[PDB]
């Protein structure tokens, strides 16, 4: 009965839906990345262009997407989001398979611009898919995790942590599956498989969400119901500016500007120095494990010493491991100048990942619990927009100077920005638990 109890319940169905959504949307993302690379071939520059376009679009559009979410009905919003995202995936896949079948034929069928037109259409549709995914993630996580968790702060925390663990495991195990499939036949078949997976996943997820709605009756009472884009943008941004939790929300955003974060740094440096071929799997495993300890440490610290003090401790940890990284880069051993050094750098990045995940969970919970219900849309959309604005600045920094001394200067600047973010969070903390900021023991 207990096993049957959980299997039905109201948390497990939400977990299942989130897992399916993330799995589909990451397999498709990596498949899109590989296909475009195969088509053009120019690495680094094109990936950065794609990321820049994505971030620039999502900033502006999510600013309005939050408003559209907060002033409609929940079930309708979720259903619309799922439908849009999956239809977008199907159409983009159809076009990609078409251009693969007749590359040179489209290149000269009428003009040389057919190929570029198809390329920009692919970019546009893959973008629309990302907007839909952002919208559904916002609404599902924020609104439904807040309402289904009830009044128990402990249950809210456990649920946030479980979502983040599901996300890290899905990242580490998804690329691998995409690879095995894509490398077991002509590309046209991998695309087909991914599209079919997405469609069946959409149907099952709609059914699961309807079922969840039927078990939480408090999900139907929305307080508030019972040219214009510029106005919405301005109102959203000023509302974000005037919120009592502003300095906290900005503190997270400054953490996104960093070359010290994974993915970019690992690919770049390993390609320049240390390809190996087996160390990268170990690094992926280490990153996953440390993310998991970050989540569990967040839970324990929140239970023991409260929220704000959890943030301060997480910040201390991340800053210490990044000082280890800076000592590493300045060594006369010369990683690139300005084997021990790369190890030190990766260790710094990993422990910084621990601290970063703890801090992110803290800030997310603060947002969830201290924001008035009617704005559970505007504020979150604006925060996403700002995070991706800093990510765009990071991309500008990466593309500007690709030299080794440039990499050293980038490390220093990223550490500086992390420090400024943590200083703003410290000011927010002092403005709350004034004087007694220390003394973890109550």
């Amino acid at each position: 009965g207990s096993l049957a109890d959980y299997l039905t319940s109201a948390k497990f169905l939400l977990y299942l839906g989130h897992s399916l959504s993330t799995w589909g949307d990451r397999m498709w993302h990596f498949a899109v990345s590989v296909f475009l690379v195969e088509l053009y071939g120019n690495s680094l520059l094109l990936t950065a262009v794609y990321g820049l376009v994505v971030a620039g679009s999502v900033l502006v559009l999510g600013a309005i997407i939050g408003d559209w979410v907060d002033k409609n009905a929940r079930l309708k919003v979720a259903q619309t989001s799922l439908v849009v995202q999956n239809v977008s995936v199907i159409l983009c896949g159809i076009i990609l398979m078409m251009v693969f079948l007749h590359k040179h034929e489209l290149l000269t069928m009428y003009h040389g611009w057919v190929l570029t037109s198809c390329y920009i259409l692919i970019i546009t549709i893959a973008n629309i898919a990302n907007l839909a995914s952002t919208a559904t993630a916002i609404t599902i996580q924020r609104d439904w995790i807040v309402v289904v968790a009830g009044e128990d702060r402990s249950k809210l925390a456990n649920m946030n942590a479980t979502i983040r663990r599901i996300d890290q495991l899905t990242n580490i195990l998804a690329p691998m599956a995409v690879g095995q499939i894509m490398t077991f036949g002509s590309p046209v078949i991998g695309c087909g498989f991914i599209s079919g997976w997405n469609l069946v996943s959409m149907c099952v997820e709609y059914v699961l969400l309807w079922k969840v709605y039927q078990k939480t009756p408090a999900l139907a009472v929305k307080a508030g119901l019972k040219a214009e884009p510029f106005r919405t943008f301005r109102d959203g941004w000023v509302s974000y500016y005037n919120q009592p939790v502003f300095l906290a929300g900005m503190g997270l955003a400054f953490l996104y500007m960093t070359v010290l974060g994974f993915d970019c740094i690992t690919t770049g440096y390993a390609y320049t120095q240390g390809l190996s071929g087996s160390i990268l799997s170990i690094l992926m495993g280490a990153s996953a494990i440390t993310g998991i300890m970050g989540t569990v440490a967040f839970t324990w610290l929140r239970r023991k010493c409260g929220l704000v003090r959890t943030g301060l401790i997480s910040g201390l940890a991340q800053l210490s491991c990044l000082i280890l990284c800076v000592i590493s880069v300045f060594m006369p051993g010369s990683p690139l100048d300005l084997i021990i050094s790369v190890s030190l750098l990766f260790a710094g990045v990993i422990a910084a990942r621990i601290g970063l995940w703890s801090f992110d969970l803290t800030v997310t919970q603060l947002l969830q619990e201290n924001v008035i219900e009617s704005e559970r849309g505007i504020i979150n959309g604006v925060q996403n927009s700002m995070n991706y604005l800093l990510d765009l600045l990071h991309f500008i920094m990466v593309i500007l100077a690709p030299n080794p001394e440039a990499f050293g200067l980038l490390v220093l600047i990223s550490v500086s920005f992390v420090a400024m973010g943590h200083i703003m969070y410290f000011r927010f903390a002092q403005n709350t638990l004034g004087n007694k900021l220390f003394a973890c023991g109550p």
Epitope: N242, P244, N370, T432, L433, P442
Partner: antibody
């Protein structure tokens, strides 16, 4: 339905020790923040402090730090206020309040008020 | 700390008119302002939070407005049971400070 009950009609000699009870019914105390508020005769309201029943953290006002304590008990679902070194000034009406988060928009429910008189 | 001031203490009003209570802060607090009503020998109750939003169950004649530094509470067509005490509270930063409060009366 939600309500909070307080003891009342307290007469105290100056310099003594006194406790004020706040019993909550209809909800778990550990899920909210408990605030204590003072009202002087023909004077504005003043904020004393708050407590988190989950872990027992207490923040007070700087002008009230030396002579005010707040305790909570989740097993009996109650809160207590401790005042020390009372003078004739301290006679007032004290209120119990419930808040959602750190920066909650409002107090939704209040006690009935307790009258404390320092007499001789 | 942030000091909150209400300039006028007494509103001499007749029935059915519109009145405006003013609350002016000493710092740019933003939007984090709430209003309360209390009667003699009673406990204060919510009227408006975040300076614009009303609380479920409150009558519609109560409206809130203002932003940044100045805030106002507008009463339309008040009747014989709105004769009470009103004050404004902020929650932008700690410690929390309450307004001095304003009381209403009647004309004769």
């Amino acid at each position: 339905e939600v309500q909070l009950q307080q003891s009342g009609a307290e007469l105290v000699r100056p310099g003594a020790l006194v406790k004020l009870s706040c019993k909550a019914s209809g909800f778990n105390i550990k899920d909210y923040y408990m605030h204590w508020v003072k009202e002087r005769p023909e004077q504005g309201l003043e904020w004393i402090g708050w407590i988190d029943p989950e872990n027992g953290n207490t923040i007070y006002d700087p002008k009230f730090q030396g002579k005010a304590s707040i305790t909570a008990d989740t097993s009996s679902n109650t809160a207590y206020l401790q005042l020390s070194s009372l003078t004739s000034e301290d006679t007032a009406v004290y209120y119990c309040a419930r808040k959602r988060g750190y920066y909650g928009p409002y107090f939704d429910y209040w006690g009935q008020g307790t009258t404390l008189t320092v007499s001789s | 700390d942030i000091v909150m001031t209400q300039s006028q203490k007494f509103m001499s009003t007749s029935v059915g008119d519109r009145v405006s209570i003013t609350c002016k802060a000493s710092q740019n607090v933003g939007t984090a302002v709430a209003w309360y009503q209390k009667k003699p020998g009673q406990s204060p109750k919510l009227l408006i939070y975040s300076a614009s939003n009303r609380y479920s169950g409150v009558p519609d004649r109560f409206t809130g407005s203002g932003s940044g530094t100045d805030f106002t509470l507008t009463i339309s067509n008040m009747q014989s049971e709105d004769l009470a005490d009103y004050f404004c509270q902020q929650y932008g930063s700690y410690p929390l400070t309450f307004g001095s409060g304003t009381k209403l009366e009647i004309k004769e």
